Amino acid sequence: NNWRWFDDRSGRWCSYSASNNSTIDSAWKSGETSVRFTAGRRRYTVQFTTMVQVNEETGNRRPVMLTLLRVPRLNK
Amino acid sequence: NNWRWFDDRSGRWCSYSASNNSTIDSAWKSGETSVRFTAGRRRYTVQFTTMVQVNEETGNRRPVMLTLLRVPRLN
Amino acid sequence: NWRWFDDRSGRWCSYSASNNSTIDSAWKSGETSVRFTAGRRRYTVQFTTMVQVNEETGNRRPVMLTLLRVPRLN
Amino acid sequence: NWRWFDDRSGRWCSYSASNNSTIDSAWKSGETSVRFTAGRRRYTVQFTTMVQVNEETGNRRPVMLTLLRVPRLNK
Ligand SMILES: Nc1ncnc2c1ncn2[C@@H]1O[C@H](COP(=O)(O)OP(=O)(O)OC[C@H]2O[C@H](O)[C@H](O)[C@@H]2O)[C@@H](O)[C@H]1O
Ligand SMILES: [Cl-]
Ligand SMILES: [Cl-]
Ligand SMILES: [Cl-]
Ligand SMILES: [Cl-]
Ligand SMILES: [Cl-]
């Protein structure tokens, strides 16, 4: 949905699974400074103070972004 | 609770109930141009293209806003 | 990019070009408030409550900041 | 207010004041992209993907726009 992480291999921003997006976005809305999530057993932490995702198995750091919708909304 | 409506009587922005905030925020995230909700004995439409809430019983209009959290977050 | 709500017309209204520039400059500088005048009336915008206040009467009208989509559409 | 991500250090990095101003001026004017130079390096920032492209090598560096809280907090 609205969070993305950048894949350096493909050179593209990528969406999370619905479940992981909801876990991240819920922690964002609750004021937490970081959040843990998994893809299967693979562990990750998103650090909101640096906007980086840390792969907790390889240590690789990928940037994250929060997409923003226009305000006000455009007419259809 | 990230949506707010302005109360001209008190001069303050006000929160929605958790459930009404969720209805509004779910329609916002889904790309809808407006959303209806019920609070007490009144039905309201939030018009996202104008950022105004309309009381459908009386026609009264109140402005709305979406709060935004800082990016990046502070330590 | 800044607007104030006019309850008489029931609509958000744009600020004048100069008032918009004055308000947006203070916003970007991290200030908590900014002064301006319109129609020979003195106002303060309070960014911590997102309202404009008539300094003589105390009347509060809400303000909003338009936001651009991120990413941008093609 | 604009930042680019450095995959070597794993950190977001600031632009020079002049390059930040070039990027932000194009952002505010509705452009879909903007070119800038830093020394011998030549880049395009693509706002539709939030990526900076090195015009010589094609290397992609993600970019971000910092966002100030609304409403603002008291000091
Ligand atoms: N940003 C603005 N830009 C242009 N016009 C504005 C703005 N803000 C308000 N106005 C207009 O400014 C006018 C006043 O709104 P207000 O400054 O809030 O103060 P009050 O409501 O206590 O009215 C104060 C006195 O003015 C009258 O004679 C009344 O009888 C009062 O005696 C409205 O027309 C607004 O649309
Ligand atoms: Cl990268
Ligand atoms: Cl990895
Ligand atoms: Cl009402
Ligand atoms: Cl004005
Ligand atoms: Cl590069």
Residue numbers in the entry:
A (entry chain B): 1615 to 1690
B (entry chain C): 1615 to 1689
C (entry chain D): 1616 to 1689
D (entry chain A): 1616 to 1690
Manuscript excerpt for this entry:
The WWE domain is a relatively under-researched domain found in twelve human proteins and characterized by a conserved tryptophan-tryptophan-glutamate (WWE) sequence motif. Six of these WWE domain-containing proteins also contain domains with E3 ubiquitin ligase activity. Here, we present novel crystal structures of the HUWE1, TRIP12, and DTX1 WWE domains in complex with PAR building blocks and their analogs, thus enabling a comprehensive analysis of the PAR binding site structural diversity. A highly conserved feature in all determined structures is the recognition and therefore the interactions involving the adenine ring of the ligands.
Unlike RNF146 WWE, the single domain WWE family members HUWE1 and TRIP12 exhibit higher potency for ADPr over iso-ADPr in our binding assays. The HUWE1-ADPr and TRIP12-ADP crystal structures revealed high conservation of the ligand-binding sites, with most of the ligand interactions being conserved. The phosphate groups of the two ligands occupy pockets with favorable polar and positively charged groups, interacting with Tyr1658, Asn1669, Thr1672, Asn1674, and Arg1676 in HUWE1 and Tyr809, Asn820, Thr823, Thr825, Arg827 in TRIP12. Despite the terminal ribose having electron density in the HUWE1-ADPr structure, it points towards the protein surface with no additional directed protein–ligand interactions, indicating that the ADP moiety may be the smallest unit that HUWE1 and TRIP12 recognize. Firstly, Tyr107 that makes a key interaction with the distal ribose oxygen of iso-ADPr in RNF146, is replaced by tryptophans in HUWE1 (Trp1619) and TRIP12 (Trp771)—the tryptophans would be incapable of making a similar interaction with iso-ADPr. Secondly, the region interacting with the distal phosphate of iso-ADPr in RNF146 contains suitable polar and positively charged residues, while the corresponding region in HUWE1 and TRIP12 contain some acidic residues including two aspartic acids (1621–1622 in HUWE1 and 773–774 in TRIP12), making it less positively charged, and therefore less favorable for potential interactions with the distal phosphate moiety of iso-ADPr, explaining the lower iso-ADPr potencies observed. Taken together, structural and affinity data suggest that the WWE pocket of HUWE1 and TRIP12 recognize the terminal ADP moiety of PAR, rather than the iso-ADPr moiety as described for RNF146. An overlay of the TRIP12-ADP and HUWE1-ADPr structures show a highly conserved ADP binding site, with the substitution of Thr825 in TRIP12 with Asn1674 in HUWE1 being one of the small differences. A mutation of Asn1674 to threonine in HUWE1 had no effect on PAR11-mer binding, indicating that the potency of PAR binding is determined by factors outside of the ligand-binding pocket, possibly including the PAR polymer structure.
